[PDB]
Amino acid sequence: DIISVALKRHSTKAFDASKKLTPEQAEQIKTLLQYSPSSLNSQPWHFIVASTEEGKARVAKSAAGNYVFSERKMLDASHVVVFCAKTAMDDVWLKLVVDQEDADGRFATPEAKAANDKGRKFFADMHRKDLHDDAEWMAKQVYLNVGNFLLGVAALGLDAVPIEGFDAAILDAEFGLKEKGYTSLVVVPVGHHSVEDFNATLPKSRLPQNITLTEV
Amino acid sequence: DIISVALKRHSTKAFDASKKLTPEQAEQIKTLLQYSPSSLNSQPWHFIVASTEEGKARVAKSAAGNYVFSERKMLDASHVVVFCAKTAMDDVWLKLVVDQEDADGRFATPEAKAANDKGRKFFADMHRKDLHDDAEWMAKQVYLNVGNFLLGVAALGLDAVPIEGFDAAILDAEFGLKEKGYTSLVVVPVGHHSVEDFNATLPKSRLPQNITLTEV
Ligand SMILES: Cc1cc2nc3c(=O)[nH]c(=O)nc-3n(C[C@H](O)[C@H](O)[C@H](O)COP(=O)(O)O)c2cc1C
Ligand SMILES: Cc1cc2nc3c(=O)[nH]c(=O)nc-3n(C[C@H](O)[C@H](O)[C@H](O)COP(=O)(O)O)c2cc1C
């Protein structure tokens, strides 16, 4: 059950390089990335899934020097996902979303499709023109995806760790993300922990609900 | 099977107000909120869980103006969670986190505790004093929580919908959040869908991996 998963999962501090995802598992992690929800189904994201040694080494270049402890985790894990946000919400993307919803059969009529599109455009424009927060708004959706993904991979019986400890300017350059309209936010190595993962056996810790939670 | 969960869950558009969470489920959703991961275990969040008629009505004040379509979702669901971020990161919070980690048994020695605290302070200060993005950085952690939560509640067999379509100034005012040091970000009604939930039967739609996902 899912509460067991939530209580037992942890941030892996060291991975066993010999233990690879199965082909089935490697497909499943892609499914999780794709099927996360997002505001307006805006899906303002790109994922880099590095499974080869040379692909993982390219991602690991982002932690060289200043984030050396992140470096090893990225090399040892089986698969390493880089979560990227769009840097701007263009109309081409908005049309791509609504056209895919139509292709998938979500609209009974042209009127329903046009209403969907107009609604999405309205809130997108608000973020960009009035709140001046479109980059942050899209980045929030990517973090939501990360949350979904962490729980998902734990439920599959896999180990992971989310990493903000990397140099996004280096990762961005390595993969030419700026020119493509994306920026890297979180790196998540996935695989199986080694005996050197001291965090596998430490108790979890969270603030008590009497501090963080009000019931009304 | 968490992939089945991810592929079958959906954003509920209409709730059956007579179908309440069980007592155990109401505790389980609180566990999911508490046990989300977060950068540095910073846990920069507060949750309001509305389960009474009075409580839900208070939240539903925020479904005004452009956001009236959210109102029924908030009133008819069994339990409505307001996800809030801290508005600033302070040392008092940082000390609370590390002291809890110590109480839970995460540190073998004084030296280990003091290293943990120093590292957390270093990165927290980088956000607040150098990047000037601590509000955004904290809100990102809250969104991660939401993503964990939506998959969690689906895995419990519960329906939910994440809502950004509410007026956060209205909600903040109603619950006195600003003075308490928090701001409302996402509202998530939880319960069971009705037969008038048109989204329960519509196909799910996502962009193809050939657009969103690069393998290396
Ligand atoms: C967005 C995010 C970024 C994180 N960055 C790092 C990181 O760079 N290195 C690290 O060792 N752990 C990292 N963590 C892991 C957290 O310290 C961990 O999630 C937290 O202490 C709670 O522990 P748990 O994940 O074992 O439940 C990060 C977590 C999140 C959510
Ligand atoms: C952060 C966030 C905010 C959302 N805001 C709303 C909202 O105000 N009202 C609404 O009906 N749905 C809202 N949605 C639901 C999305 O439209 C939905 O997640 C998306 O179309 C994907 O469909 P699914 O959740 O059924 O998989 C929101 C989703 C997210 C993740």
Numbering used by the authors:
A (entry chain B), B (entry chain A): 2 to 217
From the paper:
Escherichia coli NfsB has been studied extensively for its potential for cancer gene therapy by reducing the prodrug CB1954 to a cytotoxic derivative.
The most active double mutant was T41L/N71S, where at position 41 the threonine is replaced by leucine, and at position 71 the asparagine is replaced by serine. The double T41L/N71S mutant combines the effects of two single mutations determined previously. On replacing N71 with S71, in most of the structures of all the mutants, a water-mediated hydrogen bond to the FMN cofactor is found from the Oγ of S71 instead of the direct hydrogen bond from the NH2 of N71. This water molecule also forms a hydrogen bond with K74, as does N71 NH2 in the wild-type enzyme. However, unlike N71, the S71 does not form a hydrogen bond with FMN O4. The leucine side chain at position 41 is larger than the native threonine. At T41, the T41L mutation in the double mutant shows the same effects as seen in the single T41L mutant and the T41L/N71S/F124W mutant studied by Bai et al.. This is most likely due to the N71S mutation, where a direct hydrogen bond to the FMN cofactor is replaced by a water-mediated bond.
